[PDB]
Amino acid sequence: EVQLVESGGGLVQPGRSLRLSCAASGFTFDDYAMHWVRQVPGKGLEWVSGISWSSGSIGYADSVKGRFTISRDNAKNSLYLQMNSLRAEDTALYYCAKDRASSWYAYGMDVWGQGTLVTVSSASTKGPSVFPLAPSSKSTSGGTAALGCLVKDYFPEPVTVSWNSGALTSGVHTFPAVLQSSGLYSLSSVVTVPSSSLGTQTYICNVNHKPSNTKVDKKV
Amino acid sequence: NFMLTQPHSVSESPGKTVTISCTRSSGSIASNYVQWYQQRPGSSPTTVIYDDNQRPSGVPNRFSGSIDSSSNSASLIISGLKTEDEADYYCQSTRVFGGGTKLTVLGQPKAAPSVTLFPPSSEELQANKATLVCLISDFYPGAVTVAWKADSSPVKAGVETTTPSKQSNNKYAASSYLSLTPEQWKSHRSYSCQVTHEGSTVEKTVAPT
């Protein structure tokens, strides 16, 4: 029946160009026109471009003038999206959408593809930076304390954060890493301890990063 | 132009009929069209409703679209059934997309989020860097919004919040990191991190030193 496949996406450095290819299967290729819309992490989607039944009727998103171009070949039922001068805020997904009429004025699409991955950033292997997150000024709610260790700007995944060589496992909590605009990962790990141990007990967090071969110990 | 507004998320228990509406900013709702789209996490989005209230082939009825103007908004009503059909939804009119509302099936009782705020450490301040860490734990369902304010106005630049994920205890947790310079850290009297969970707002305020 109606199946949609896309390919050609991936990671590349800024200042390069790319060409995504969307091939269909089954339904007739000439009789319909297909848009180009992108999914961004967390947030929703935003229209990019739109083709006509054959050519002529064209349309681009407001912010994507010059950077992107769209064309199709009706011979091998394929769609080519060529673009250059990539940037850092477009590191998201790109979905292939097929409309229902022969013109894109309708702005109603159905039977999407499966999504493709693109991400442009300076992927550099850098050792993590570890900082101690101290608790409040000897204030507690139920006798507990909030001590932690923050790992900043490490690439790539994954990292291992333990406390006192991982001897203590109760009250520990490791949170998922976050990717910032710098293209490097960061996270933090917290440990719940009684408030009576503040100033009399030493807590050491050990950080291991095999890709960067970083082995550090930080005292909170 | 305009900017459609919809609630961030909604929680429901199996066997209840619920309505979800997205509000149009400017212009009459009846002037243009609306379509409801659905997607499963890790799955490509698929259309569920098009042309106001029309059902594409394969739709098992149930999905009903309301196009009452009211306060210039449109809604969809779903009958009481949970199954596995609990995921984010979208509405589209013309070159405009919404944030998306997450439909969650209520299992274990909802838990009040636990929010802890960590100001930047002095060691980080020695490196001309500052990071405010707002950590949210033991909250269900995984649908929250994190905001930052400099004690007199909300701030958005430099913030990075992790999407909620399912832990082992069938509960969600997340973190938010705000990057600020030490000079601006000492310039402002305090910084407040606000977390909203199922309409419940909790704020934590921290001050330098």
Place this chain on the structure above:
Amino acid sequence: KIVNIGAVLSTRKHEQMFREAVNQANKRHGSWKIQLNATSVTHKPNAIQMALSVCEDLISSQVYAILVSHPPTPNDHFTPTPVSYTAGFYRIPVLGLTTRMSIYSDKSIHLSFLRTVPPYSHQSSVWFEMMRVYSWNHIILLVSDDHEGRAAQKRLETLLEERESKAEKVLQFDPGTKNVTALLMEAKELEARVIILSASEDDAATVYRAAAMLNMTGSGYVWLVGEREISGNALRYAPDGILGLQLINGKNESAHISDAVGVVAQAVHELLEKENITDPPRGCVGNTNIWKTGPLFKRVLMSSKYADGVTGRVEFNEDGDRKFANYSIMNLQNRKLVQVGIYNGTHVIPNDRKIIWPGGETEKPRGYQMSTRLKIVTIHQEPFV
């Protein structure tokens, strides 16, 4: 800014349907720019009054196109001739909806006119296509002759010369005549048995009566008649086992109205993003100049089409009339009109029902006789004769 689309409908209900359809089309893509208002006017008797009315009440609003339709009560008393002439004086394109007469298919006379229904020659195209499936080769083509008959004969002859074959004695007859017994009797004595008829209603009835009285409608024969030759007088004077034709939708004005409005709106929006735009004339009197962009509009209205709607897929061909229609072969079985097949495009498709031929012979009667009564000619000369 604001663009109008005039239309000449049949009755008030269809006018309201047209207004609702244009409102719906505006409820589709309407992101400012265009507004696409619509005007209308009802058919009128006479013709001079109709031409004056269309002129004033429609060209007084710089309409970008005109929609016509067949008159409700009569059959040919109010053909859309006046609208075509008056609105083709300025090269303002018009769309025909439910008129099929093969006089509007040539652009020498009607300079801006394109329909959404195949006129009458594509019936001859189906004749030729269905001839191959049952594999009979020799035909006699009994056709009337005012303009329709000439067009149908020319189309079939042009198509039939691809495979280098030729037709037998194609024979005509004047419109509205009587006593065609001599010509039919001449056609009776020959070596072909499949006969193809293309004539109007009353002429078809007369031919059927004459053939019946010559007992030429008996077994071993096979007929072929277009849409007009049946369904007008097809339960009073028609033989048994005759194979007709029928366009599926035809008189379903609402669907055609919706589709035409869709096509016009899509093409207008496609055109409006062009550098050289000039508005139609404002008044009928005092202006005698061709709307400069007019012809260009026609082109962007011709090639594009493709508004996939209720009636199917629409794609206007080189000279107006829509191509790729869907006919429906019929047949008579005891004064009934059961369906036997469907012709979609470039290929017929039979059905699960059997077919009764002219005489009840459940077979596939081929047409050939091979007289074996040759007449010979010799000349008196020499010891040879």
